[PDB]
């Protein structure tokens, strides 16, 4: 039960992916819907408007799914590699009330990436039953930048 839910394939549409904010200027728009694993082109990742531990990227499955893992990736803009080292994960059924992913009575801090190109697969044990998913970058290199994939089934 570790099938891509549609981040890379775009089975999860752009409108399903949202964030706390995103970085936009004259030349680049690092929109939330660009947070798709292995995405190509320019500005090929999500970046929040500012770098703090309270920024989040949201995926609405529009349907309760069984999430058994997430895969994360950074990105390299020119000479600057950008990626998140650690993150939290929260979920919701209505998209308004949120709950952090606890493990062994303690809120789990997942270990993310060490570079801008290698995907890192983090396991979600116990598996998550949720319609909404949120990822919360806690520490990062250079800038918060994210391409991801959700793994599981229905």
């Amino acid at each position: 039960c570790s099938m891509p839910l549609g981040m890379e394939s775009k089975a999860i549409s752009d409108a399903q992916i949202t964030a706390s904010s995103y970085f936009t200027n004259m030349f680049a728009t690092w929109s939330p819907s660009k947070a798709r694993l292995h995405l190509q082109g320019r500005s090929n990742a999500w970046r929040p408007q500012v770098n703090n531990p309270k920024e989040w990227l949201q995926v609405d499955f529009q349907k309760t799914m069984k999430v058994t893992g997430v895969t994360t990736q950074g990105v390299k803009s020119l000479l600057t590699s950008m990626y998140v080292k650690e993150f939290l994960i929260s979920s919701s059924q209505d998209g308004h009330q949120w709950t952090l992913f606890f493990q062994n009575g303690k809120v789990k801090v997942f270990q993310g990436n060490q570079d801008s190109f290698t995907p890192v697969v983090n396991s979600l044990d116990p598996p998550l039953l949720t319609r909404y998913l949120r990822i919360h970058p806690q520490s990062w290199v250079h800038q918060i930048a994210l391409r991801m994939e959700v793994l599981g089934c229905e």
Partner: antibody
Amino acid sequence: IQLVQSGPELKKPGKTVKISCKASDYTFTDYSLHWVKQAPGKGLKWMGWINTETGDPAYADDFKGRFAFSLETSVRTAYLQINNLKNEDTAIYFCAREDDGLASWGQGTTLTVSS
Amino acid sequence: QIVLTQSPAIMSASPGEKVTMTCSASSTVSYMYWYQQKPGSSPRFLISDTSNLASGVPVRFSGSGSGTSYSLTISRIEAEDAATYYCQHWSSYPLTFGGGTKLELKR
């Protein structure tokens, strides 16, 4: 940055054809590559795409089976292979570079399937 | 799963006129893209991200829209604008083209 496709092809049904799409420079591995079918007199129909950095192909629903997207990065070339050709495969095939839209298009390849 | 509808299929116009071609999506998309195709030619990229002009595109071309409603407008029709125009999205699987709108000139 240009895309140059191979020359016209004539193949008997049931056989195999491999259409090439060559880029003018090596930056093509920074952009995804799409394939489009234009049947005689018809509009534009998407066949799927391939990640040029990864090599992973993804296929549109109608094109799962006899269709294969491959890659040869050393010669800046993408390929479209069609196995077990049908008469309905007769069309023009385009490759297109993705860059906030299909920004570069090959000149197209005319495929005829007849005995 | 998003479908694109261009209407009408064929649209007539005199040179110098202002024409607007519409493309409605069954569901929200991020950006709409537009292409021009003439007989015997490859499609030509017109509009990137709903309203950005592609390389080499004359300024009389403009794109607009949001949500599920998008349009392509030519301010002053030239004879070289006789062609088929396609809209396109890539917000979800599968990538989809509109059915096309043929632009015929009156003379």
